[PDB]
Amino acid sequence: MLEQPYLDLAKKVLDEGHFKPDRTHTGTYSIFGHQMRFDLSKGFPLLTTKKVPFGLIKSELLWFLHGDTNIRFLLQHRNHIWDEWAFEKWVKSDEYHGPDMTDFGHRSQKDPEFAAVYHEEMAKFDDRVLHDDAFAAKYGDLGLVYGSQWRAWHTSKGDTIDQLGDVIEQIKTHPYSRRLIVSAWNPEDVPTMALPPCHTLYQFYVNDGKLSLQLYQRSADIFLGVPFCIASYALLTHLVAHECGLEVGEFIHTFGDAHLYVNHLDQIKEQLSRTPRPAPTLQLNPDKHDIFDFDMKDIKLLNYDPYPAIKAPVAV
Amino acid sequence: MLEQPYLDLAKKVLDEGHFKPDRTHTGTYSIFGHQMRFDLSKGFPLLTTKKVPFGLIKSELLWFLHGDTNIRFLLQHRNHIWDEWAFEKWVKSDEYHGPDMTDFGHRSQKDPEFAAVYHEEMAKFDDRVLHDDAFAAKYGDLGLVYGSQWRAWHTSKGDTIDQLGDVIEQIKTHPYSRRLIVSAWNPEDVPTMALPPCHTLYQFYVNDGKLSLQLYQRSADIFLGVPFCIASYALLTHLVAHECGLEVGEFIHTFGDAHLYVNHLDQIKEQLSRTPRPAPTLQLNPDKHDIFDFDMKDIKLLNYDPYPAIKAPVAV
Ligand SMILES: Nc1ccn([C@H]2C[C@H](O)[C@@H](COP(=O)(O)O)O2)c(=O)n1
Ligand SMILES: Nc1ccn([C@H]2C[C@H](O)[C@@H](COP(=O)(O)O)O2)c(=O)n1
């Protein structure tokens, strides 16, 4: 079945992975260097052995395609994937007047009544961002995030390059170019960056009338991170090919540090006992073309029957 | 034997590769997405089925490590790997007064007496660069080349970042970092770059006391390019590990567009009839540590017995 490569990656780390202490401090099992490919002509690589929220995947993707970096857009789409980063700056800043929302990321998970306090302050910040234009502009803009990297790279001479935009035109005029690259790694920002991009860089390739994309991910959370990632980039591969009028080829996922957090072992072993179901089908609005103008109703995921979801603690 | 992966890549392209027209215009057979690893603890991955000039590999590598971008250094090391690029600017410029060295890259290979004229003008330029300080500074500096990318990345606010330098310190203090990346791809230079970097970006990894490096190469000439590349980066992996006091792990080569030029088919098939010999051994000067201060006598390649060299036309 289409998702097998992922299952084999999980098995692999679990069997051949060596223990490696980590940044967050909850040790991992890791392998360095891995590559797996999915033939997008067979279906959409959205995991069926575990429920994955596609809606969160696309709203976040459209956010990137708009070159948007403001959390407000996601919020009106009920996506809260990036709230924490915005909250971080806000809480550790002048205006924040309230409880000790310091180190909230761990203390919340721990157990205290603090969870309510945190979740409340967050709920608060979230409403401000969504209605207070000055606040949104001040605390909701994350700045250097995938949207600005892909669509507004900062030139040395104070300007803006739309990488992804330029790359799409290239695929249209010079489909056989070996230079169709989009990079998110900027040497000058990473030294003091919150979380340097995990999806470091990707490359397009055209031949036989099919489009393929290869992503280089410096670091990956096999359990929590990879599933979303495979889908997000498989979606991109479809969108661009829809714009360029090409057929979809494969999606190739190359890893640097592929890893499984020790406290995800039971959960991953739960997944491994399940057997894949037929891959779901994706269909884009046949009318619309300029993917930048794409809207959520323009993307559909036909018949997806996944096993229930599996819960597991986040590590940051 | 250690070099088998390369042989399997060549077989693979030759058997499974699809034809793809190319930039230079001498069609290729290509595959998209490939990864191969070499266990550096077994020997040095310098091809034995075909003679590869190691001396050219290291003089070019030391040139990179010095953050040097001037052709003069290589010339005093009898390395002429980058002369063409320097000649290009020089010939198509004010001062050049002489024959029609225009489009020299093809006309030279073709057959005319021109080869002598070209080779003479080149021989001329080469002597100027090596002795005329004003000329060297004007026409010998290539500018944006691996040396400046690795060791003097240009900040937006007009400054210089020594990526590789910083990364080595990181490996020394935070060996388990998943952010040990060195990128050569700058979105603002590639639009109007002669030849955007093929060795796009690499990543370091440490665990078990061994250092590993993974290189992402957007485009590769299996026949002429890959052999050198594998060695150059295997050398780097040894040097850095010598500085950091780590044991050597593997070298992982990830490709984007792995390709074989149609006019290299016979030659590659020559190689494929040979059987690998034991991998050579590399040993660095045990005294010296700051690799930046490394000199050629500080690197040695013990017992390398390759089959003769194979000749093949260059395509640019
Ligand atoms: N889109 C993302 C973002 C993060 N991570 C993971 C990678 C690491 O597990 C951790 C980030 O830590 P580090 O900077 O050390 O890689 O989160 C991931 O798998 N996918
Ligand atoms: N160090 C290098 C430099 C170049 N090439 C090859 C890659 C392509 O075959 C051609 C450059 O063309 P392009 O820009 O289209 O990739 O030269 C290579 O294999 N290794």
Supply the CATH number for residue A288's domain.
Answer: 3.30.572.10
Query: Residue B183 to residues A186, B58, B148: CA-CA distances in angstroms?
Result: 8, 20, 11
**What's the rounded Cα separation, in Å, for the pair B62 and B165?**
14
* Closest by Cα among A252, A218, A208, A225 to A316: A225
Q: Which residues pair with A7 in a beta bridge?
A: none
**What's the rounded Cα separation, in Å, for the pair B103 and B106?**
6
Task: Verify whether residue A198 is a known catalytic residue.
Answer: yes
Q: Is the CB of A5 under 6 A from ligand 1?
A: no
Number of domains composing chain A: 1
Instruction: Name the B residues in 91-150 with CB < 8 Å from any A CB.
Output: none
Residues A63/A73, Cβ–Cβ less than 8 Å: yes
Q: At what angle do helices A226-244 and A163-173 cross, to 10 degrees?
A: 50
Q: What is the β-pairing status of strands A181-183 and A18-20?
A: unpaired
Residues B90/B125, Cβ–Cβ less than 8 Å: yes
Nearest chain A Cα distance for residue B108, angstroms? 26
CB contact under 8 A, B153 and A22: no
Angle at A178 between CA A174 and CA A184, to 5 degrees: 105
**What's the rounded Cα separation, in Å, for the pair A151 and A205?**
20
Burial profile A224-262: b = 16 or more Cβ within 10 angstroms, e = fewer: bbbbbbbbbbbbbbbbbbbbbebebbbbbbbbbbbbbbe
Query: Residue A146 to residues A16, A141, A183, B275: CA-CA distances in angstroms?
Result: 32, 12, 10, 48
**What's the rounded Cα separation, in Å, for the pair A293 and A63?**
11
Neighbours of B206 (CB within 10 A): 23
Q: Which residues pair with B213 in a beta bridge?
A: B204, B251
The 8-class DSSP code of residue A102 comes to: T
Measure A23 CA to ligand 1 centroid, in angstroms: 10
Measure A81 CA to ligand 1 centroid, in angstroms: 13
**Phi/psi at B202 (5° precision):** -135, 160
Residue A164: partners with Cβ closer than 8 Å, 6 or more residues away:
A65, A150, A151, A182
The dihedral formed by the CA atoms of B306, B309, B313 and B316, expressed in degrees to the nearest 10: 40
Amino acid identity of residue B10, one-letter, is: A
Q: Which residues pair with B216 in a beta bridge?
A: B201, B254
Query: Residue B34 to residues A37, A252, B38, B217: CA-CA distances in angstroms?
Result: 10, 9, 14, 10
PDB resolution in Å: 2.5
**What's the rounded Cα separation, in Å, for the pair A149 and A185?**
8
Residue B110: partners with Cβ closer than 8 Å, 6 or more residues away:
none
Token pair listed for A31: 């392998």
Token pair listed for A165: 């935009």
Residue bearing tokens 């790997």: B81
Neighbours of B262 (CB within 10 A): 13
Interface test with A, best of B19, B181, B222 (most A CBs within 10 A): B181
Nearest chain A Cα distance for residue B117, angstroms? 33
Nearest chain B Cα distance for residue A258, angstroms? 10
CB contact under 8 A, A178 and B256: yes
Neighbours of B285 (CB within 10 A): 13
Closest Cα to atom 17 of ligand 2: B221
**What's the rounded Cα separation, in Å, for the pair A162 and A192?**
23
Token pair listed for B141: 């500096």
**What's the rounded Cα separation, in Å, for the pair A314 and A108?**
11
**What's the rounded Cα separation, in Å, for the pair A218 and A159?**
27
Interface contact A189, partner B, CB < 8 A = no
* Closest by Cα among B162, B153, B164, B285 to B213: B164
Contact residues, chain A, for B35 at CB < 8 Å:
33-35, 254
What is the distance of C-alpha B168 from the center of its chain?
20
Closest ligand to Cα B25:
2
B211: Cα within 13 Å, side-chain hemisphere? 28
CB contact under 8 A, B205 and A158: no
**What's the rounded Cα separation, in Å, for the pair A271 and A287?**
38
Residues A234/A248, Cβ–Cβ less than 8 Å: no
Residues B281/B23, Cβ–Cβ less than 8 Å: no
Containing structural domain, residue A77 = 1-316
**What's the rounded Cα separation, in Å, for the pair B199 and B252?**
13
Q: What is the β-pairing status of strands B18-20 and A299-302?
A: unpaired
**What's the rounded Cα separation, in Å, for the pair B256 and B190?**
17
Which residue stretches of A44-103 are H helix?
54-65, 72-75, 83-91
**What's the rounded Cα separation, in Å, for the pair B204 and A19?**
17
Residue A316: partners with Cβ closer than 8 Å, 6 or more residues away:
A24, A84, A105
**Phi/psi at A221 (5° precision):** -95, 95
Token pair listed for A262: 């020790």
The dihedral formed by the CA atoms of B17, B316, B199 and B257, expressed in degrees to the nearest 10: -20
Nearest beta carbon to residue B20 from set A179, A207, A257: A207
Residues B122/B139, Cβ–Cβ less than 8 Å: no
**What's the rounded Cα separation, in Å, for the pair B201 and B215?**
6
* Closest by Cα among B149, B186, B258 to A178: B258
The 8-class DSSP code of residue B140 comes to: I
Which residue stretches of B44-199 are H helix?
54-65, 72-75, 83-91, 104-110, 114-131, 133-135, 146-151, 163-173
Interface contact A35, partner B, CB < 8 A = yes
CB contact under 8 A, B156 and A156: yes
**What's the rounded Cα separation, in Å, for the pair B44 and A9?**
29
Measure A227 CA to ligand 1 centroid, in angstroms: 13
Q: At what angle do helices B83-91 and B114-131 cross, to 10 degrees?
A: 100
Q: Is the CB of A231 under 6 A from ligand 1?
A: no
Instruction: Provide the experimental method for this PDB entry.
Output: X-ray
* Residue to probe by mutation, ligand 2, list B28, B31, B34, B198, most atoms within 8 Å of CB: B198
Residues A233/A248, Cβ–Cβ less than 8 Å: no
**What's the rounded Cα separation, in Å, for the pair B276 and B279?**
8
Amino acid identity of residue B59, one-letter, is: S
Query: Residue B261 to residues A223, A300, B4, B104, B254: CA-CA distances in angstroms?
Result: 41, 41, 21, 21, 19
Nearest atom in ligand 2 to the alpha carbon of residue B229 is 1
Angle at B60 between CA B206 and CA B185, to 5 degrees: 60
Nearest chain B Cα distance for residue A169, angstroms? 13
Interface test with A, best of B13, B19, B23, B32 (most A CBs within 10 A): B32
Which residue stretches of B132-255 are H helix?
133-135, 146-151, 163-173, 226-244
Interface contact A158, partner B, CB < 8 A = yes
Contact residues, chain A, for B160 at CB < 8 Å:
none
Residue tagged active-site, from A1, A14, A130, A198: A198
**What's the rounded Cα separation, in Å, for the pair B219 and B89?**
24
Neighbours of A127 (CB within 10 A): 12
Contact residues, chain B, for A212 at CB < 8 Å:
32-33
Residues A82/A122, Cβ–Cβ less than 8 Å: no
Q: Is the CB of A219 under 6 A from ligand 1?
A: yes
Q: CA-based Rg of chain B, rounded to a whole angstrom?
A: 20
Residues B106/B313, Cβ–Cβ less than 8 Å: no
Helix (H), strand (E) counts: chain B:
11, 10
| Number of residues assigned to chain A | 316
**What's the rounded Cα separation, in Å, for the pair A78 and A59?**
9
Residue tagged active-site, from B198, B201, B265, B312: B198
A103 exposure class (CB count in 10 Å sphere: 0-12, 13-18, 19+): exposed
Residues B169/B163, Cβ–Cβ less than 8 Å: no
SS3 content of chain B, % helix, strand, coil (to 5): 40, 20, 40
Give the 3-state secondary structure of residue A278.
coil
Give the 3-state secondary structure of residue B88.
helix
**What's the rounded Cα separation, in Å, for the pair B163 and B148?**
10
Residues B100/B92, Cβ–Cβ less than 8 Å: no
Q: What is the β-pairing status of strands A299-302 and A210-221?
A: unpaired
* Closest by Cα among B237, B275, B209, B222 to B44: B237
Q: At what angle do helices A226-244 and A54-65 cross, to 10 degrees?
A: 50
Q: Is the CB of A258 under 6 A from ligand 1?
A: no
Which residue stretches of A217-296 are H helix?
226-244, 265-271
Closest Cα to atom 3 of ligand 1: A198
